[PDB]
């Protein structure tokens, strides 16, 4: 059969990832322009929301050194690939867990609908990638919203998950933080309530 060049193998980000990708968090001086957790400027169209969560290991303990990267469409279901601090909305962002509380946050807008390759619409979702010491290759996942039951019930991606009980691990819970709309998405890397992780 035909073989191409092999892809460079992954390695863990390690415990000091913050020095390279999360300056402030590493508690080091930042540069002029940094890629961080604010996807939308206050004047961005759409429903402004706060996202927050914790990451758990197989012993049910908090993962305090995690690093997450997110990718989502704007409120009109469009992917904004030209990253710029001047934009009112960026589809890409970064966050990390507090070495203390071990909680991450992100400021964005509820994403609009996008269709799959076959032209079927997918429920509003946020694409997540998780990195950390002990993780040899980053884990991919999706965050869906509990207030979109209708759409979720029909997602071509959620429906690829064999056991309905497993699907529920991808649904963020609508809540309020300081009387502001929020959704909590906890990730359980291993064990009971283990989060669904994708290959693609």
């Amino acid at each position: 059969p035909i073989e191409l060049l092999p892809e460079t193998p992954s390695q863990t980000a390690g415990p000091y990832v913050h020095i390279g990708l999360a300056l402030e968090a590493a508690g080091n001086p930042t540069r002029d322009q940094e890629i961080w957790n604010r996807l939308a400027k206050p004047d961005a169209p759409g429903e402004h929301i706060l996202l927050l969560g914790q990451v758990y290991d197989g012993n049910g303990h908090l993962v305090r050194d995690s690093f997450l990267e997110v990718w989502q469409a704007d409120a009109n279901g469009e992917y904004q690939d030209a990253y710029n601090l001047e934009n009112a909305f960026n589809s890409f962002g970064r966050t990390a867990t507090t070495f203390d509380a071990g909680e991450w946050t992100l400021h964005t807008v509820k994403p609009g609908v996008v269709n799959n390759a076959a032209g079927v619409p997918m429920a509003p979702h946020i694409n997540i990638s998780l990195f950390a010491r002990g993780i040899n290759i980053h884990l991919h996942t999706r965050l869906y919203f509990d207030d979109e039951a209708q759409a979720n019930a029909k997602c071509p991606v959620l429906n690829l998950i064999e056991q309905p009980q497993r699907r529920e691990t991808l649904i963020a819970k609508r809540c309020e933080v300081d009387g502001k709309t929020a959704y909590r998405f906890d990730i359980r890397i291993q064990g009971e309530g283990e989060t669904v992780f994708f290959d693609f």
Binding site: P6, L21, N59, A82, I189
Partner: protein
Amino acid sequence: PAQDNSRFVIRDRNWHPKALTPDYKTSIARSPRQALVSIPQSISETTGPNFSHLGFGAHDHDLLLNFGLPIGERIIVAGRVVDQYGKPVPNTLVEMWQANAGGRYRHKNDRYLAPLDPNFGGVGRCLTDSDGYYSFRTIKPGPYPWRNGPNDWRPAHIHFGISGPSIATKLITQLYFEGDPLIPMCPIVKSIANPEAVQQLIAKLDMNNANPMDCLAYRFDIVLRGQRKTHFE
């Protein structure tokens, strides 16, 4: 906005390190027990951020000046980013971080007894050129002890992060230096089962790129997932 016009060659999960690799202790509790669910590629997966408009400072890629002179082995680390088909990946974000000459990292959680270098930060970033080239100027990092087995030491290494054309291609890896005897003993390196995959992580001494009487150089090329156009979909 980005459009769904590409497909990416499927990852070889036998080439990359597996999730559960017991010699690397921390991996025990931080690895899924359920199988990954495979999904078809969509616009969500085939697109990603383009960093052409990020405002890079003039010394973003120069660890010798971006934090006097740091103490240690002056080196240039350079190479090319290509895809599996051999195609260059222009204007992509390459980010790196490492310890100082004595193996100490400029991070609060680093309690190693080797001292910090008042003239060294250990962070760099560079956008690839039209030909897929990147370059950094720094000092060679030292090995460092870590709490795994009772006497484990990481070979000298530089952490790398590369964006590529989509979230599908995004990768985090580590570069090692040609001939380091610590390589074959590292449980992290050893998370990689094929020795041939191991060799892909070793930067080679590049006397051709060195600056005489000034600094040495290392060559490290990176290969991202092949990008093809859809067909008969």
